């Protein structure tokens, strides 16, 4: 029940309501899924 190479897959922009305390675990696991990017945010200021 998943997409294929017929065309570009159905994209989605979902909103992460990450709790502040559990943020490190949430980010670690979410990166472990190997499934999500992160939209470039607050990049208007120097590094």
């Amino acid at each position: 029940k998943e997409e294929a190479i017929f065309r570009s897959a159905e994209m989605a922009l979902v909103q992460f309501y990450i709790p502040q305390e559990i943020s490190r675990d949430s980010a670690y696991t979410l990166g472990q899924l190997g499934l999500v990017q992160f939209r470039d945010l607050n990049s208007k200021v120097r590094a």
Partner: protein
């Protein structure tokens, strides 16, 4: 009402209230069975709905002892007290005539394990209201075997929370604190055990730490807490280190800071040093390196770090090093880094014709000649002495002659084959320093 004391009603503390309400019976035949009075039947009928009525309720709870009508009455009374629709009048029912509060406590301390907490909810609610403190009733409740055993049943956490949160809510009253601590010798260890193991689990950890923190607000009890159960007090730092929720870490840091405050003159600095000797300083530094999202918690961490840094003056006290020398066993304290942090003590060590060097050599020779290199205390003392000797000798190569005359030049070489890895490594470092300095 003075307060709600819901404590989130997690798991059983509300599930049992709902289930008991579910099994509600009008008990119309009970009055026909003569177990309940006509006023009692009226109380049951009115309570069937989801001032003067508080008298027949207690009268039935006392006179009628089927314990099932008692469970129903306890559930109804607790629901009425909690219900904000008439909770003001429900609280006034003891805020108007607090005389029957003792009779209610005589009724609350009853029932089975499930119903004991149900009654205790109302008991605490009436007790915690600002209209009546009743320290004697609090002491009597603290003396109840059933509730104490329930609070000691940490195996059933879902029920043990209904006890720990109840006690912590009852501990908010400053007056009840004195009696709370007096019987706390049979309550705190379970709370310490609960914190030792680490929504019910987290809430238990947070509520339990709150009771310890609230009780610790009095320095007189704080000294006893630090002394009698120093193991848990030291482990609180590790618990804060491993805690995931910010609230638990904030509570642990606040408890540690309050314990190590300028108050409690019995150990106002003694306990602070004791923690710093319990591997506290690197943990405090690591916590300082963290970015906890709480201004109060961050300020508390900064204050604790400053206190630890101020207590680190124990290293700079050459008198402290001399005292440790007087002690037969030295500890791996910041004094063991006094020379590196303050080379000034090297002159004192050199003085009196290598007086301190001879003392350290004597300590090492006494440890070796008695063996016991596997003994943990002996191993720690030997390692500290070897590290200090390595620091001193490298700071003044002329002491090599004194060490050789003492036989320590070959003694440390023999100790290079010590059983302990730490001891062997420290001996190797010391010998390399001595051999490297003497090679010039």
């Amino acid at each position: 009402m003075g307060a709600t004391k819901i404590l989130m009603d997690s798991t059983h503390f509300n599930e049992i209230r709902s289930i008991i309400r579910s099994r509600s019976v009008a008990w119309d035949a009970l009055a026909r069975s003569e177990e309940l009075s006509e006023i009692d039947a009226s109380t049951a009928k009115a309570l069937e709905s989801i001032g003067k009525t508080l008298i027949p309720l207690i009268h039935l709870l006392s006179t009628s002892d089927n314990e099932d009508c008692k469970k129903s009455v306890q559930n109804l009374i607790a629901e009425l007290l909690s219900s904000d629709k008439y909770g003001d009048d429900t609280v006034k029912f003891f805020q108007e005539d607090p005389k029957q509060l003792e009779q209610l406590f005589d009724v609350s301390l009853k029932g089975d394990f499930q119903t004991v907490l149900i009654s205790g909810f109302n008991v605490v609610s009436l007790l915690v209201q600002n209209g009546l403190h009743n320290v004697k009733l609090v002491e009597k409740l603290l003396k109840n075997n059933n509730l104490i055993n329930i609070l000691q049943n940490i195996e059933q956490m879902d029920t043990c929370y209904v006890c720990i949160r109840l006690l912590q809510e009852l501990a908010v009253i400053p007056e009840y604190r004195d009696v709370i601590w007096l019987h706390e010798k049979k309550f705190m260890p379970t709370l310490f055990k609960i914190l030792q193991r680490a929504h019910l689990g987290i809430q238990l950890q947070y509520h339990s730490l709150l009771l310890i923190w609230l009780l610790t607000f009095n320095p007189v009890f704080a000294n006893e807490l630090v002394q009698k159960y120093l193991s848990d007090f030291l482990d609180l730092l590790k618990l804060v280190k491993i805690t995931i929720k910010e609230k638990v870490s904030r509570l642990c840091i606040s408890i540690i800071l309050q314990c190590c405050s300028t108050r409690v003159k019995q150990h106002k600095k003694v306990i602070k040093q004791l923690l710093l000797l319990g591997n506290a300083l690197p943990t405090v530094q690591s916590l300082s390196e963290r970015k906890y999202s709480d201004e109060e918690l961050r300020q508390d961490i900064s204050n604790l770090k400053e206190i630890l840094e101020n207590e680190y003056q124990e290293l700079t006290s050459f008198d402290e090093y001399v005292a440790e020398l007087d002690s037969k066993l030295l500890c791996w304290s910041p004094p063991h880094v006094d020379n590196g942090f303050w080379s000034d003590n090297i002159d004192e060590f050199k003085k009196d014709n290598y007086k301190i060097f001879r003392q350290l050599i004597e300590l090492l020779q006494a440890k070796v000649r008695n063996g016991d290199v596997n003994a943990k205390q002996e191993k720690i003392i030997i390692q500290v002495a070897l590290n200090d000797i390595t620091h001193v000798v490298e700071l003044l190569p002329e002491s090599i002659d004194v060490l050789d005359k003492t036989g320590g030049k070959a003694d440390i070489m023999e100790l290079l084959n010590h059983s302990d890895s730490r001891v062997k490594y420290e001996a190797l470092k010391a010998t390399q320093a001595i051999i490297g300095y003497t090679f010039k």
